[PDB]
Design an enzyme around this catalytic site. Structure first.
Site, PDB file in Angstrom:
ATOM      1  NE  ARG A 150      -0.456  -2.885   3.290  1.00 40.30           N
ATOM      2  CZ  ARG A 150       0.012  -3.892   2.538  1.00 40.30           C
ATOM      3  NH1 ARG A 150      -0.338  -4.044   1.256  1.00 40.30           N
ATOM      4  NH2 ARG A 150       0.850  -4.774   3.081  1.00 40.30           N
TER       5      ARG A 150
ATOM      6  CE  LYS B 268       7.436  -6.710 -29.228  1.00 44.47           C
ATOM      7  NZ  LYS B 268       8.839  -7.172 -29.215  1.00 44.47           N
TER       8      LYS B 268
ATOM      9  CE1 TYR C 273      12.918  -5.352 -30.922  1.00 46.30           C
ATOM     10  CE2 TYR C 273      13.627  -3.998 -29.057  1.00 46.30           C
ATOM     11  CZ  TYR C 273      12.785  -4.219 -30.134  1.00 46.30           C
ATOM     12  OH  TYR C 273      11.843  -3.261 -30.405  1.00 46.30           O
TER      13      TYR C 273
ATOM     14  CG  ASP D 117      14.207 -10.493 -23.804  1.00 46.63           C
ATOM     15  OD1 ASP D 117      13.106 -11.082 -23.766  1.00 46.63           O
ATOM     16  OD2 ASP D 117      14.461  -9.455 -24.476  1.00 46.63           O
TER      17      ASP D 117
END
Lengths: 392, 392, 382, 390
Positions: free
Chosen positions: A55, A205, A108, A180
């Site tokens: 919280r 994705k 990537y 990844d």
């Protein structure tokens, strides 16, 4: 432990704690208030000593995080605005000048750009190694090696790493392993169960599945994830995920197992079809027996995935003509959508460049990448078949 | 030519180009497809050259960016996932090891943390200077000085910088001036018209106005913004703004003028009320004649703002009591919401690391900050009144 | 009692009840579960006996309802998918074959169509009466009169009803008075405080303020609203409001006072301007001293509103040319948006209500820009 | 070649939309706008004059809703679709359009509760005559047809007993006499049953259920001929209900439809396994699942439905104390009265929706909406809950 599909639907939420709401309410609120002053100070003393209070954090994002942690088998999750948000927040937290990071040979594009033109320009040293060659990885290790980072399978050829073998080397030398796991999702591969410390996702994705949000996820130990939250996200990137998009991502995750089953079944048929066509020189699909790392693929991934890469005999010209001919597949750089997508980096992301520059980590003139979608396989076959004719 | 309110409502959009839709459709799509690979290639090639290609970027984000650029009087805008995303994407783009950044004396906490514990730990040199002291600023300039960064007004005392004076100095030495304009918004202050090169915003606050999104904005020259988009955002932070949230932000901006008028009107009544009360030692409100930089504030700001800071006689304990007695104001850290918010940092953000470590001195200790909301001023007066009585 | 602006932001919600969330979470859920079968028996052993619990109802819609009830000074609120949803749910609940509904002389088009071609074709009797003519309204009352329904102000000339006068007549027959308060909003007029039983709104217009949702509101006494919920909405229309759109509506309501002030201020300037232009034959704006019902308007409305209708001397051709020349105002049929809107019914809604009648929904743009646009369009109307 | 219809899954994902017409956007942009503007005054007279005469020219219609409508039409094999704020919005907009005083509507013997209430306490109190007939008994249907019979309306399978009708058989009677046939196809979806292809005139859905699939929106759909759908749009929706669907919710409904085939396959696969398991348990007295040969209309279910659905009803031995105890023992199934969610749901009408009444629907009856969870977890839940009802 309930089954994966059960957990993807239910983990972390009981309707009875939110007035019986079957779907969790969406906390589209930028701020939370305090009942007293000293209550508010307990929270902000907690962070900065290293601790994360749930919280003063967003319950929608907290649920997404908990559910993703469950599916990966990890202790803690963090939700971010993009896969790049996850990658940068993680690496900015874990590395400082003088540290070395060891990298998979092929990454990537924006991950490569972040490393070489971003954090690598701030005193962090980079080295690429073939993560399939455990000899070479061991030889590349130094005491300054702080992080080993790779994708598996990796673009462009779906090259794999033996995650548990890498993890052994990391444990011997004292390095942190970041994987990844975007392509596989936790439904197909769980790197934390193989010794990795952290997994990152472009949830944009397959996790989303529907191409309508941009999001990232990190999963790992509470200790690491808390640091990445408190430093990487809060101070170094501000890559905050919208509660609206977090809720849509959880909606997508509720069908992950079903979608991945269909992506994989469609991709296997398409891959076997492509292997038999005269226009096709080479195919990279983990589910073909010809795949160089077939044995490792079957050991580490429960299914061979929705992604296919292949090379056409006529090189860049044939690649262009094939891509332009597709009518049902769309020409686009993303993946993991319901809609089938294709890209041909040589005439798309790397076009104004010369043939010789597409080489060192390497882009074939004829390399086409397919993200096989959820459409009827016969319609996809018909589209690919005509586009192969047109490629000549 | 058209007025501020007209541009906040209409700039950059004609319904006649989107099938008559009065409100622009929301592009909640992670990707865009290409009619050809050649078309796709041209897009990525010019991105690699440093050119941003509008369309094949998100039209919802593009419209928000255009509208913010118009309101600030700048060439180009950029939308990001948070204020911190704006600030970090900017600073990561503009700075490298060996560069120096000169900072305003007091900064928002996460900005402070980013500079000292983030980018500052990657070899970028920091120095704090009083940005109202043009002689101190000139003397602090070095050949390494690349960026000058500050907020105006700044916490906790609303200390103003002399933006035009700073910019003159910056132009002489070849430094880039970045101003966090969150507090004022372009409706009250336009730092680019005073010579700043870039402005950043936590659009989470007043631009949104309704406390339901997190978002950031950068506005400045095309050359600067393009670098920040293409490097800071795309590679170094991944702080991508949801199109859903971008649309809500545009919704908030349509009432910005009205809301700021009311925030300022209410805050002035409360500040003049506070000035007449025995429990109040000292008040920091730009609209009182006794504000030390009243004249400079008036040159830079068209109205004195929605924020009040004041010190109670009785220090920390009086503040604790003031805060816990509030019934309409909420205890919270944010600002710029329709709801009135209060914080007493001595006992909220800064209680557990106690009065010795508050060695800023003149900053902390007894200081309460009010974000004056849009409620009926008589109700807000009554709430402050009774809390003051409870503070004794 | 807190002031209108305070209540529009706060009423019905304390962050401390929802984990400190300053903005209430959006309950985008179609269904709610039960902790035991014992508990889930309570929630349907209760709607069957005409009782509305706030448990299987949606908390986002409930908050919107509570806030609207507070702003109108009514007991209970109900949120629906559109203004037509509010109107039809209400009238389907209150009327049966043989009953009569007495109607204002002019109504919103789909309201008129609903009455004449919908419910009126199922044996409900209709009569139109001038709701400002109290003697005529009294003489129109019959034992079949069950509902008196009107808008005030009404299109096309902003004709006003005497709400308290109507309520006094209705009370002698126990008839239910329903006022469509879309134009004014609760910020400018509160028909329940003048004796009406129910108000309806197209919240699509000013309440939302921003042209991005379609929604309806009913506010009134608890008994009536409960029946409209449990019969009109649940069974007869299914006009269910999305929690997403309800949340956006509440977002709009937080600035209602400020937006209405600006709409009114801008329309006042444009009405002063238009009233003295050569091309303008007649103007209908409640804030003009020469508005026929100026005094009654000021008794019911705290401000004269954001809507202007006027008639161009050169008829339908002038109206056409005026409309086509507008560059800032948009040609559209809605109202109550930030964006200024214009319509000329003779050449838009009615291909074959004066020939030169143009209605403006004056928006929140800078008045100097709106004036320039109207000025050049007037010149083009020659 | 090219005149082949694309497969159901291809159409659920793509039908009606080409990214090249919206600047390349892979997902269609959401038209969250209440109104559309006109380039001239004349363009606008043509739209409004057209709608009056009977037409749905797009007419400055909402493109998000239009795409949803065209996609649902393709999936059902109908000419046109209409999207509405709820299932009850679809049902009421349809019946308010098609019926007037003096007309008769013939109804299936059991209906969803709010539909029953609309008919008996709503439109039925405005001079429309109602009669219930067993829509599986084609002789009884034929014998109930009168010159005033305007509409035949039913669900198949019907809420809550799964009673089926022979839709083609009904349609044939309706062709001979002249009535309009309206089928509530909520339970099956167009993936499992397409009543229009069997000769029904209109289908309605609570898209709230399976079409959405994720329990987060409320929505309705009507599909049928262009003429009937246009009429329902222009009268029922526009004037008589105002049951307008949010573009935001329409986009979420399209998102749900992209996985409809996959979800329905899993709902049905799980329900078959659970139904076969339940049939063999000591405490189960009877079981009604269309995929078991014990189902009273097994062959009609096989003939009309490509798979037997996600819904099970069964009776426990031991009465209400049994059902009450079974329900309260469930730890994965939720206690709720809805269906077609990812989450598995259960109800016991005796201790829940009909608890206020006395025994004078069996007392141990339980209705399950079987979700997408792992079947081994669902079996374990039902198995441990059967133990506790013992």
């Amino acid at each position: 432990l309930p089954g994966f599909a059960t957990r993807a639907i239910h983990h972390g939420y009981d309707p009875q704690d939110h007035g019986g709401a079957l779907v969790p309410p969406v906390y589209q609120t930028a701020t939370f208030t305090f009942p007293t002053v000293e209550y508010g100070a307990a929270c902000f003393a907690g962070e900065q000593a290293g601790h994360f209070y749930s919280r003063i954090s967003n319950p929608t994002l907290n649920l997404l995080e908990a559910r993703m942690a469950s599916l990966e088998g990890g202790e803690a999750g963090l939700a971010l605005a993009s896969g790049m948000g996850a990658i940068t927040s993680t690496l900015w937290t874990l590395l400082r000048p003088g540290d070395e990071v060891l990298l998979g040979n092929t990454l990537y594009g924006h991950t490569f750009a972040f490393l070489h033109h971003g954090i690598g320009e701030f005193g962090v040293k980079l080295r690429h190694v073939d993560m399939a060659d455990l000899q070479a990885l061991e030889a590349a290790m130094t005491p300054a090696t702080r992080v080993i980072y790779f994708e598996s399978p990796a673009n462009p050829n779906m090259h794999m790493a033996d995650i548990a073998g890498v993890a052994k080397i990391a444990r011997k030398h004292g390095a942190t392993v970041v994987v990844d796991n975007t392509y596989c999702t936790p439904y197909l591969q769980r790197p934390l169960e193989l010794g990795a410390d952290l997994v990152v996702h472009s949830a944009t994705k397959y996790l989303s599945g529907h191409g309508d949000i941009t999001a990232g996820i990190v999963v790992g130990s509470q200790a690491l994830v808390d640091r990445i939250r408190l430093q990487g996200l809060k101070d170094m990137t501000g890559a905050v995920l919208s509660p609206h998009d977090a809720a849509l991502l959880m909606r997508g995750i509720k069908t992950l197992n079903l979608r991945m089953d269909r992506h994989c079944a469609n991709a296997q048929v398409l891959a076997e079809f492509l292997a038999r066509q005269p226009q096709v020189e080479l195919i990279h699909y983990p589910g073909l027996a010809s795949f160089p790392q077939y044995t490792l693929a079957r050991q580490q991934m429960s299914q061979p995935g929705g992604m296919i890469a292949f090379e056409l005999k006529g090189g860049i010209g044939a690649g262009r003509r094939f891509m332009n001919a597709l009518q049902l597949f769309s020409r686009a750089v993303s993946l993991g959508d319901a809609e089938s997508l294709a890209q041909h980096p040589a005439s798309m992301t790397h076009s104004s460049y010369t043939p010789e520059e597409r080489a060192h980590y390497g882009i074939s003139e004829g390399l086409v990448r397919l993200s096989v979608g959820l459409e009827d396989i016969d319609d996809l076959l018909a589209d690919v078949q005509q586009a192969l004719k047109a490629s000549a």
